[PDB]
Amino acid sequence: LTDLPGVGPSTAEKLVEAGYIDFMKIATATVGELTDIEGISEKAAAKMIMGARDLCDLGFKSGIDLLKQRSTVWKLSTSSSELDSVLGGGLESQSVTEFAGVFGSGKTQIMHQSCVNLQNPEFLFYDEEAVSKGEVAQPKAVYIDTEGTFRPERIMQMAEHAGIDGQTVLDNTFVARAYNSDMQMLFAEKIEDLIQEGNNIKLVVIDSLTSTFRNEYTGRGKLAERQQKLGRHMATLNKLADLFNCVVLVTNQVSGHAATFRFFVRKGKGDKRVAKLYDSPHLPDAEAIFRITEKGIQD
Ligand SMILES: Nc1ncnc2c1ncn2[C@@H]1O[C@H](COP(=O)(O)OP(=O)(O)NP(=O)(O)O)[C@@H](O)[C@H]1O
Ligand SMILES: [K+]
Ligand SMILES: [K+]
Ligand SMILES: [K+]
Ligand SMILES: [Mg+2]
Ligand SMILES: [Mg+2]
Numbered sequence: 001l002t003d004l005p006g007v008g009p010s011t012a013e014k015l016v017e018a019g020y021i022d023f024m025k026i027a028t029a030t031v032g033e034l035t036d037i038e039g040i041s042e043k044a045a046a047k048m049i050m051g052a053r054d055l056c057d058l059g060f061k062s063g064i065d066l067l068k069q070r071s072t073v074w075k076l077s078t079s080s081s082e083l084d085s086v087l088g089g090g091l092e093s094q095s096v097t098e099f100a101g102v103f104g105s106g107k108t109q110i111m112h113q114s115c116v117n118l119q120n121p122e123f124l125f126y127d128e129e130a131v132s133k134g135e136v137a138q139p140k141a142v143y144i145d146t147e148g149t150f151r152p153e154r155i156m157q158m159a160e161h162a163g164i165d166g167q168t169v170l171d172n173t174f175v176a177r178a179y180n181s182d183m184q185m186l187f188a189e190k191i192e193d194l195i196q197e198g199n200n201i202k203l204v205v206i207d208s209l210t211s212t213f214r215n216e217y218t219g220r221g222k223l224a225e226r227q228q229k230l231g232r233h234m235a236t237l238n239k240l241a242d243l244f245n246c247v248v249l250v251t252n253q254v255s256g257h258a259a260t261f262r263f264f265v266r267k268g269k270g271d272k273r274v275a276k277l278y279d280s281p282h283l284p285d286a287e288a289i290f291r292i293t294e295k296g297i298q299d
Contacts, residue, residue, distance in 0.1 A: 001026075003055065006047035014039055021196055024243050027052030074126030074136060076203065076247050077117055078110065079162075079297040080290035086277045089125055092261070093202070093247045096237050098209065099275070100252040101265035106273050106292050107251040108149050110265075111205045113296040114249060115141040115173045116158045118203045119165075135245070141173040141203035142194065144187050146211050150175050161295035174199075181212040185233050188240070195244055202246045206237070209250035210257075227257070234258040 001012040004026065018037045020026050026034070026048055034045035053059075061069065075090035084090045091097050091114065101107050117123040118141050126136065143150055155173070156166030174194060178184035184206065195201050210230070217226035234257055241248040250259065262279035271291035278285050290299045 004048045005051035006044040007051075011040065011044065011048075019192070019196075023052045023055050027056045027058055028239075028243070068130060071127045071130035072245060074124055074131050074245070076114060077123040077125065078290075079113055079117060079123075080288060080299055082288035082299065083275055083290055083297070086275070086283070086286045086288040087261075088280075088283050090123075091247045091249065093245050094242045095260040096234065096241060096248045096250060096258070097261035097263070098250050098252055098259035099263045099265055100254045101263075101275075102255050102267070103253065105265040105267055106297075107253070107265065108147070108207055109154075109292050110297060111143065111207045111249060111251060112151070112154050113158055114203060114205065114247075115143060116155060116162060116164060116169050116296065119159070119169050119172060120162060124202075131245075136200075136202060138200050139172070139202035140194075140199045141205065142191050142201055143173055143175045143205045143207070144178055144184055145175055146178045146184055146206070146208045148177065149207070150177075157294060158296035174201075178212065181216055181229060181233075184212050185229070185236070188233065188236055191240060192244075201244060204237070204240065204246060204248045206248070206250040208253060210252050230257050 001007050001015055002009060004023070007015070014037050015026070020029065029049060031042045031045045031049065034040050034049065035042045072094070074093050075087070077084050077090045078087070099107050099110050118139050124136050124139070152170055155169050159166035159169050176187040178187055188206070191201055191204060213226055213230050217223060237248050237250070238258070238260070240246070254264070260281060261277070263275045263277055265273060265275045268274050268289065271293055273290055273292055275288045275290070276285070277283065277288070290297055
């Protein structure tokens, strides 16, 4: 941090204690966040912010450079061929992908399957020129379970049928049981801590994304607070995905809020499942057929 203009050793101490360790967090911070540090004037606060942006080259970019920012995005396979296709490759890092679906459509399964697939290096697709091996080395997942449906047995089973060691998935997946929107939100904000603690968090799951909010703001009279709170939560999730280049997945029970990718899943005949991609920034709407068996998502 002393590389940053207007940052002495004393200021560095305060900054690291206030949670500002890397340059990006400072570069993307507001003078408010920093001034509230105490002992930090807005003069020095704005100076280090300007500095951090430069050290990270956060200015205008054109020509080929526009292609290079987009190449930092890696994708996670869903184990379903048709799904990965409709996804333009697989689940994207630096974005929030939502799987909305009717009761029992498989929302949770997809979340579990994803934590498992994260441990199979062959399932992470990326441009080895823009994303080094080290950046996706020892990947870990964070699972914020709002429903109480996280099943370690299901992780083991999905893993075994894939050849991956189940226990290895469990060792590299953090699970946080949230009982309300406050915990759900706080757990999300605390993911930054797991990273500064050395954990290469590359997958974040929120199952469910909307359960707590609906249950707490039922009275449609204070639906304003709800949208604001959830929106603040989505902002946190997106920033988290961008800065730490990881894939964020969320589920939503449906029979408005932000989400960069939106799927609606429904049950087909028996094993069959139909996921409809109905919103994304660069892809056409489309359907994907697959199934859920003892092996997880397949076909
Ligand atoms: N071990 C398994 N073997 C085969 N199928 C399984 C297994 N475990 C779960 N399933 C399938 O997964 C379905 C339920 O998946 P689930 O992910 O819980 O749907 P959901 O959308 O999350 N339901 P809900 O959260 O209540 O709205 C079951 O009813 C089973 O068909
Ligand atoms: K300095
Ligand atoms: K079923
Ligand atoms: K969108
Ligand atoms: Mg993004
Ligand atoms: Mg579920």
